[PDB]
Amino acid sequence: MNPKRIRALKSGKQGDGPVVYWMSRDQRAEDNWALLFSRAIAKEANVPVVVVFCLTDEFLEAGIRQYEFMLKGLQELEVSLSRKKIPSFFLRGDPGEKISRFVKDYNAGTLVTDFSPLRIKNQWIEKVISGISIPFFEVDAHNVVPCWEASQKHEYAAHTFRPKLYALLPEFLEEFPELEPNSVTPEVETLSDVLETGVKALLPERALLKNKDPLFEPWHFEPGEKAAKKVMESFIADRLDSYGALRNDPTKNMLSNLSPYLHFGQISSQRVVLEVEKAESNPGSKKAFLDEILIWKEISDNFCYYNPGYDGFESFPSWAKESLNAHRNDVRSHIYTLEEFEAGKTHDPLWNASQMELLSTGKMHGYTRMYWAKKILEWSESPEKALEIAICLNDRYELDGRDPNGYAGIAWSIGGVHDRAWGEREVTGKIRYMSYEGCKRKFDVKLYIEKYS
């Protein structure tokens, strides 16, 4: 129980009632520092712990694919917490109104939540803080090293953040204690109903084909905490060995496929890192994978935490902004609208295949994501319109979207965040370029294009 994982958002008079865990980003019962601290605090106060989750009004800004994945897991989570004698309350509406009202209606003693550097989460904290009188803590249950501990400032490169993070692994990379149940079960609708109503409201905006057939295939990733562990186990046993050599090959499915579970916190990245560390496989593949789930994942939280405008042109490096400004007035070879990007109606069959994989599976291969976002910059009227389009399609169709990794990944592709300058070209300037022929020499593009007609 390292106290550096927890941080106080506001101090107050601790009440004589249950400790409330405002679960948001880490939707799991196991390996959850936020829930573990909540139980520890509730134990010292001789009071039970309770979990509250808010089904917010912004769910209509995504699709059915994300909504069902999240709620199906929450249905499983409600069963796990029950076995621990921990009740779970699911509220519908504004977290500011609902969290504050729950604190007063149930006489909460202390309020706890997990950490997310996203703007929407800060928005909720502001409203909640001004509507409660009890202490309020947040715990980093998503990063191995607490975001505010890994670095005190924005890190402009992976090689400047990698040593800082590895130096702190010996202290923060540790096993998880068991979640002790509640002593006695203490004394707002069912999830099957909130799911049915939500799906009905999302159906008109469901992505379809010409024949009114849904595009999304929901049999690629089963949601839940139990499914995530099976995915983790399969990766270490079968794919981890080849990960280092086939991570950049879209035609081969040699990725961990953990992002949907990591995004919703249905599985702890610290748990994955522990299991990987103790697994014997190709050394370079271990290094490659750990580099992605430790450095690149947690540097994205670092990006969004220390850059209020992480989703804007203002957060780009100075060299990228001055380079992109110098080529604003360059004549673009193609200009596509949002609907044209969305439907995969460009001239580049590789880009359209990447969009089709996004629409059909909700998870685009890591390598094609880079190619996908860079051509949006190349075929847009400006870098600002490119960020807008990339963020829209990413957050709308990726199962792992609306995530710090997404904004940090898009900022890398379009603005060169966490990257260096390259040969100066027109339109894209010094931003790293990825040509069509460059991909042909990297993998069998024809197979990838064929798999997503």
Ligand X SMILES: Cc1cc2nc3c(=O)[nH]c(=O)nc-3n(C[C@H](O)[C@H](O)[C@H](O)COP(=O)(O)OP(=O)(O)OC[C@H]3O[C@@H](n4cnc5c(N)ncnc54)[C@H](O)[C@@H]3O)c2cc1C
User: What are the binding residues for FAD?
Assistant: 243, 256-259, 292, 363, 369, 394, 400, 405
94/395 with CB nearer ligand X: 395
**HEC-encoded secondary structure of 357-401:** HHHHHCCCCHHHHHHHHHHHHHCCCCHHHHHHHHHHHHHHHCCCC
Compute the distance between CA of residue 65 and CA of residue 68 in angstroms, rounded to an integer: 6
Chosen residue from 48, 73, 224, 406 binding ligand X by CB under 6 A: 406
Chosen residue from 354, 360, 361, 405 binding ligand X by CB under 6 A: 405
Compute the distance between CA of residue 286 and CA of residue 236 in angstroms, rounded to an integer: 10
Closest separation in Å from C-beta 152 to ligand X: 21
Closest separation in Å from C-beta 23 to ligand X: 19
CB 74 within 8 A of CB 27: yes
Chosen residue from 72, 400, 428, 439 binding ligand X by CB under 6 A: 400
Amino acid at 124: W
Q: Which of 123, 408, 363 is nearest to 264 (CA)?
A: 363
# chain residues binding ligand X, by CB under 6 A: 28
Residue 155 in the binding site for ligand X (CB under 6 A)? no
- Strand-pair category, 110-114 with 49-55: unpaired
Chosen residue from 370, 377, 387, 445 binding ligand X by CB under 6 A: 370
Residue 256 in the binding site for ligand X (CB under 6 A)? yes
Q: Which of 329, 339, 321 is nearest to 417 (CA)?
A: 321
Residue 263 in the binding site for ligand X (CB under 6 A)? yes
Compute the distance between CA of residue 374 and CA of residue 379 in angstroms, rounded to an integer: 9
104/287 with CB nearer ligand X: 287
Residue 401 in the binding site for ligand X (CB under 6 A)? yes
Residue 247 in the binding site for ligand X (CB under 6 A)? yes
Residue 369 in the binding site for ligand X (CB under 6 A)? yes
93/284 with CB nearer ligand X: 284
Tell me how many degrees the CA angle 316-116-133 measures, rounded to the nearest 5. 130
Q: Which stretch binds ligand X (CB under 6 A): 15-23, 170-178, 278-286, 409-417?
A: 409-417
Residue 394 in the binding site for ligand X (CB under 6 A)? yes
172's tokens: 């923060």
Chosen residue from 131, 181, 218, 366 binding ligand X by CB under 6 A: 366
Sheet of 88-92, strand order: 6-10, 136-139, 110-114, 19-22, 49-55, 88-92
Residue 271 in the binding site for ligand X (CB under 6 A)? no
**Maximum distance among all Cα pairs of the chain, rounded to whole angstroms:** 69
Residues contacting 270, CB < 8 A, separation 6+: 31, 144, 173, 176
Residue 433 in the binding site for ligand X (CB under 6 A)? no
Segment 292 to 311, residues that bind ligand X, using CB under 6 A: 292-293, 296-297, 300
The contact set with ligand X (CB under 6 A) reads: 247, 255-259, 262-263, 292-293, 296-297, 300, 366, 369-370, 373, 394, 398, 400-401, 403, 405-406, 409-410, 412-413
